[PDB]
Every structure is written in C-alpha cells, then in structure tokens.
Design a protein around this ligand. Structure first.
Ligand code: HEM
Ligand SMILES: CN[C@H](C(=O)N[C@H](CO)Cc1csc2ccccc12)C(C)C
Length: 395
C-alpha cells in the first residue's frame, strides 16, 4: 500500500478540475489517498471504474456505517437510502420511486413551466440586473421540492440555514455542523407530527402513512428520506442549475445555439450535468465487502474507494472531446446522477426542471449576458457541491 496522497487535491475552484484527475485515468491506477476525515481510501477517476465502485455488488455503502467513513465532511451523515444496501435499499426506494419516475414528473411539468413563467415574469417586469440565483434558481428548485414534498417553502428562511450544514467540508466547524443537523431533524419531526393528526397530499403525507399504516420504514428512516430529498431538491438541484447557467453565460455561443434551436434541451441538460463538475471532489465512499481488483489495485475487504464522478464525466475513452461542452451530444452516458443501484432518484425531476428552465430563460431573454466579469462571479467554497453564490445577469 503506497504512501497516501492528501485528498482533496486542493480547493476545487470555479468549475475547474485539478489536473491530477486526467493523469489518473491515463495511468489506469487507483490513488491511495488520505482524506480529511475517516479511513484512508482509494480514489477512482476512470468512468469504467467509477461505475464499478458506484454499483458493483462487492462495493457496499451500508457497510460504511460500521466505520469512521472516509469522507471530506467532519461528521458522518445519515444518508437515508443512499447509505444502505438491499434489502433495506429496495424497501426504502419502493416508497418514493413512482412519484420520482418519468411519468410522475411529467405530471409536474405544467406547474414547473407555470412557475418558471411566473419567475421570468418577475425578471421581465423588474428589469436588469437580476441575480439569477436569488430570483430564478433558488425559487424554482425550492418551490418545486417543497410542493412535491410538502415542506412549507415559506419556512425556508429557517431550513436553508440547516440545509447548508449537510453540504459542508470546511465552511463550518464541527459543532455548528452537528447543531444544524439536529435542528433540521427536529423541524422535520415538527412536520411529520402534522401528518399523523392532519394527513397531507404530498410526498410527506404519503410516506408517514406508509410508516404508521404499513411499517415500511422506521421513524429515523422516515426522517432520513425526508431530509435527503429536501437537501437534494432545494440545494443540490439549484447548485447544478446555477452552475449550468454560469457555463452557458461564460460560453455564450453554446447559450446562443440552445436559444436559436431550443429542441436540443434534453441533450443540452445531459451535457450540462456531465460537463459541470457539480461534486466538489468525490461522492459517498464505498467499502469493499470482498477483494475487488480494479485500477491496478487489489482493494481488500473493508477498504474504502472514493468515486470521483466528475473525473469519470471527462473520461476520453467514453466521451470524445470531453473537456469541451457539446450540447448536441446524443449518447451521453455520464455519471452525474450516479450509476446503477443508487442512481439519482430525482434524475427525471432535474431533467424536467432543467430543460423547462433553460429553454424559457433563453426564450424570454435572448440578449442575456453576465453583468460582472466571469471571474468576478462569486462561488461557494468549503461545500460538497459547486455553485455560483450569485449570477448577475442583464438582457
Ligand atoms: C442536479 C441535481 C442533482 C444531481 C447532480 C444529483 C446527483 C446524484 C448522484 C450522483 C447520486 C448517486 C450517488 C452515488 O451513486 O453514490 C444521487 C442519488 C440520489 N439522489 Fe440526487 N442529485 C440531484 C438532485 C436530486 C433531487 C432533486 C432529488 C430528489 C428530490 C435527489 C435524490 C436522490 C437520492 C434520494 C439519491 C439516493 C438514491 C439511492 O440511494 O438509491 N437528488 N444523486
Ligand atoms: C448523492 N447525491 C449527492 C447529494 O445530493 N448530496 C447532498 C450533500 O452532500 C445532500 C445529501 C446529504 S445526504 C444525501 C443522501 C442522498 C442524497 C443526497 C444527500 C450529490 C452531490 C452527488
């Protein structure tokens, strides 16, 4: 076992990838690394190999609960269906799958479309400049998940505070991170209480009923599913949307090609998920439950692998000219939503939310450009997902 390399390679800056990722794919070897917290790990950079760590049966995500899990975050996160294996993974996903399928999300399309129109109504009337994050990205992603889940979006001034603590690598101290985590779990319980006495028609009303009526999940399990879907919908989705809007505003002909022929939106959304390296560095660690040889390494039983999914999204044996954004790319087998068993549940909700939002922003604002130099756009740091802090625009 080699001397561990400090991981992450450094602060992930803007939408840039550190050069070591490209070196590692070509070497075809895993990098023994020492991460800021938890066990030592093997970094996985190749697409062909990150697929294996993300979904192979010999790689466990539940067995990471019995370890000081290799991570960037100070405290280990209860990750709901993300931190479990079958059978519990099947049992937990079965309760939210149909509402997050392609069909169920298509039923949501008029509301997202109607909301995007109401948000773009707001910008049209107010005039430039607009911070697209405050006035478009956050309300659309925030109102969408709050409505589907049943969270009052009108309490966001309260859970946005706790929400960020779940993305923190270095931005928050350990005690503020744990304090925020408990506060969010308490408020989520405040929401589940209301569904016992006052059932609701939303994702939240339906899953408490499965707990009380079917015993399909535990109370901690119920709170876990509710928490990760608010984290994912309210923040992870907005980060990808603000990042994708930043990409299109700084490479404006790609914005102009999508605008002039808008029927490229499904590929353009897929390409935007592939090209933007949303993950600051790696996704959740897996631990081998037996020996798996990959990346020139015999990963032994109990050893951690860290999936560098954005590096796998630039893999040249898989995507041609992968460092160049191609909104017209037809076959786009990227891993921005994961791969296999833990493939992103809100995969379709992001697609419908992204394709509807980019198209109308372009359709309604054809002259839209950044109001500050692309380097002057502030970005989040010490967080698990990349996003601009603001997106000042003009049109
Ligand atoms: C652009 C926005 C998003 C991106 C890029 C994204 C990305 C991902 C990725 C990469 C994974 C797999 C992690 C792994 O395999 O280790 C995943 C799984 C998951 N996603 Fe997302 N996500 C986004 C938004 C959402 C939304 C809106 C929801 C639901 C409201 C959601 C819910 C989930 C859940 C529950 C899992 C765990 C699924 C499982 O464990 O089987 N995500 N997501
Ligand atoms: C796998 N999804 C990640 C995510 O949304 N991560 C967010 C912060 O890391 C929200 C989150 C915390 S636990 C958990 C469990 C399942 C889904 C989300 C979360 C992506 C950044 C790759």
């Amino acid at each position: 076992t080699p001397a561990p390399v400090r991981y992450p390679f450094g602060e992930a800056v803007r939408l840039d990838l550190h050069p070591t990722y490209a070196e590692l794919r070509e070497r075809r070897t895993l990098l023994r690394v020492r991460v800021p917290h938890g066990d030592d790990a093997w970094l996985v950079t190749r697409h062909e190999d990150v697929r294996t760590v993300l979904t192979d049966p010999r790689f466990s995500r539940a067995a990471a609960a019995g370890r000081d899990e290799a991570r960037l975050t100070p405290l280990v996160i209860r990750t709901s269906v993300m931190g479990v294996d079958p059978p519990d993974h099947t049992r937990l996903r079965r309760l939210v799958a149909t509402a997050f399928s392609r069909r169920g999300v298509e039923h949501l399309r008029p509301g997202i479309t109607a909301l995007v129109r109401r948000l773009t109504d707001d910008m049209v009337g107010q005039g430039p400049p607009v911070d697209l994050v405050r006035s478009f990205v956050t309300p659309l992603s925030g109102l969408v998940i709050c409505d589907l889940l049943g969270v009052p979006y009108a309490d966001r001034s309260r859970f946005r505070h706790w929400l960020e603590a779940f993305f923190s690598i270095t931005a928050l101290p350990a005690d503020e991170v744990a304090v925020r985590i408990e506060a969010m779990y308490g408020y989520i319980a405040e929401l589940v209480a209301l569904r016992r006495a006052e059932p609701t028609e939303d994702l939240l009303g339906g899953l408490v009923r499965a707990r009380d009526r079917d015993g399909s999940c535990s109370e901690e399990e119920l709170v876990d599913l509710a928490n990760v879907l608010l984290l994912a919908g309210y923040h992870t989705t907005a980060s990808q949307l603000a990042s994708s809007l930043f990409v299109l505003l700084t490479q404006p002909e790609h914005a102009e090609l999508l605008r002039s022929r808008p029927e490229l939106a499904p590929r353009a959304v897929e390409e935007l998920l592939r090209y933007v390296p949303l993950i600051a560095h790696v996704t959740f660690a897996r631990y081998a439950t037996e020996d798996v040889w990959l990346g020139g390494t015999l990963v032994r039983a109990g050893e951690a692998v860290l999936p560098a999914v954005p590096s796998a999204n630039r893999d040249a044996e898989v995507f041609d000219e992968p460092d160049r954004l191609d909104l017209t790319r037809r076959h786009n087998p990227h891993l921005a939503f994961g791969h296999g068993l833990h493939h992103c549940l809100g995969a379709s909700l992001v697609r419908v939310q992204m394709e509807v939002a980019l198209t109308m922003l372009l359709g309604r604002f054809p002259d839209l450009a950044l109001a500050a130099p692309p380097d002057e756009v502030p970005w989040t740091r010490g967080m698990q997902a990349r996003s601009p802090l603001r997106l000042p625009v003009t049109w």
